[PDB]
Amino acid sequence: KETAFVEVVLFESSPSGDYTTHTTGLTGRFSRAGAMLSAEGEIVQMHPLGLCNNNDEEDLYEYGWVGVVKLEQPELDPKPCLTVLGKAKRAVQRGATAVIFDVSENPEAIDQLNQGSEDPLKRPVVYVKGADAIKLMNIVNKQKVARARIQHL
């Protein structure tokens, strides 16, 4: 419904103990699958297959991680362990302060995401696409660490 303003902040720990930063600007939109709230935290890319309850026990993550998930072409996975809704539910359960889906490959996820608006999650769920989604993945691919900043105007 409302536009989501994403700030990808790259940083460098100077030898003195101080930090120096470099801000990047992107734009997405809040799905009504999640809350309409601002959020911030350490970025953690998650592989789609990683978000399944099928696995009895998984790796632990430090609470407050901004999830980043690249969706695949619809016809490649016929039935997932959980739907795009359910995977966000797993992420928030596994300590995600927010979830950001790269939707370039699958637009049908938007209809599936906004389906469950009556029972929204605690935390915000956001989506991105196009040149904005490309910039995000270029930073995710090459850099070591980065802090995301989602704000709701």
Place this chain on the structure above:
Amino acid sequence: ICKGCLSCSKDNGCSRCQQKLFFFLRREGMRQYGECLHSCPSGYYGHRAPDMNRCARCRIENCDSCFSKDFCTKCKVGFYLHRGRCFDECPDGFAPLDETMEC
């Protein structure tokens, strides 16, 4: 060079492995990507199933490589191996031998 994957991508790496390869989620900082390998990395063990072969981590204290969920293969530096368990002091019955750090 995403090798051994039937389906690959620059953003997720390997995906849905080729033939009879083990699928493994590797992490470096924030980034995560798939990998298709035949033998699991040090600190993990290969669990074979009909349609899902994955590398689960060894959660055995003082262990660097393991056979199963609860049987270590190689202990860490300064630890003696004995019946799949890693110890500091070698139990009674037999003494240590520091050539290979075992009992």
Place this chain on the structure above:
Amino acid sequence: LRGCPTHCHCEPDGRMLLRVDCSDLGLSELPSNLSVFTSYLDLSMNNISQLLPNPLPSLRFLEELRLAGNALTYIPKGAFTGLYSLKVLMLQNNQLRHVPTEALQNLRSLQSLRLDANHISYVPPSCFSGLHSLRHLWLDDNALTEIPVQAFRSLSALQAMTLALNKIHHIPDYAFGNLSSLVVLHLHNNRIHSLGKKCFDGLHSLETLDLNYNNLDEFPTAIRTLSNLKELGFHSNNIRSIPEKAFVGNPSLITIHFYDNPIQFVGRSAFQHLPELRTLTLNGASQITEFPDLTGTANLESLTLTGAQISSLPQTVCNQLPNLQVLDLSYNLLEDLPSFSVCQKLQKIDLRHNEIYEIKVDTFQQLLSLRSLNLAWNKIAIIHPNAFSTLPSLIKLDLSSNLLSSFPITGLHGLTHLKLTGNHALQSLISSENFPELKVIEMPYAYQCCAFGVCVQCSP
């Protein structure tokens, strides 16, 4: 400088020890001029037909040889003659149709041998002869038909073995005779129909057993002999019943799996003397008529037993069950209830679809950790006012379809979930106060939901 084969990558282990990696090069055959001092060799995915035109002994330092994903048909008998320090040999994803007849003999230092994901069927006797050090063995995803007892009888040093994803249909008596050191045994994803009554009498050190995803018809009574057994799995079989004194011979059992089994009858004294067992789950045991005795097993933290015909409970049942946390006895025929007060540390209770008619005073006293309580689909006519008085941590409650007329407000202050749908005699309204923090509500009439502000959620 120094003979590190062209195209390959080399690295030092300890000083003057060498680790080589020639994996995924697509080599027709191995390099001819190879340096001694190699303590690690990796030749994976190389399209190697045979070995060799010039095979290389005299590499006495070789600790780990990896030879996976190559097109190896057979192994010549004088292939690994030089390697006295070979500790770990990897031979997976090859097209071996059998274990090399005499090639793997007398590898004194060989501790691990991976022969999985091949097409092997036959294992010739004494092919593992002279393997004094062999601890670990992989033989999964192969075409085995039975246990090669004759070949395994030399392997006294074996500690782990995996015969999973094979076509093994029978385990004879004393099938693993001389394997005294064997700790782990994985036999899952086989066609194991029948096994002997003394089929596991050989191994004394066996701690874990995996009989999952198999075709067993009855409980495996070979278990009797296994004293050191800790973990046991035999889920997804066609086993029909657990006999009396089933786990009598296996104290110190910690984890057990047996789901996806059509278990109808279970012996009452079958689960006795299991002091380190923490969890128990029974679903759909219809032929259980009375509560099982749990003497010498007081450390159960999670007990769940559903789909049975249990009439009533012992009044000193909680003396046997301290340290218990969750208790699910749903879909049974329970009528009268004991104190439950000795069962402290209780957190969840689920007694839905029982035949309970009354909730007394003492039946739920001093359960300070109790959070959830489901009493849905019972015939509870009346509840004593102070029955839910001393439950401070109580948050979830479900009294759906109970035939209740009046409601006890005393205690139960500030609980989160309340379900009362089905109580048709419950016609009186409920105030917003005396019930803060209500997030999910079910109510038998719509006018009662209107009291809370709904024309937080409420379903009529």
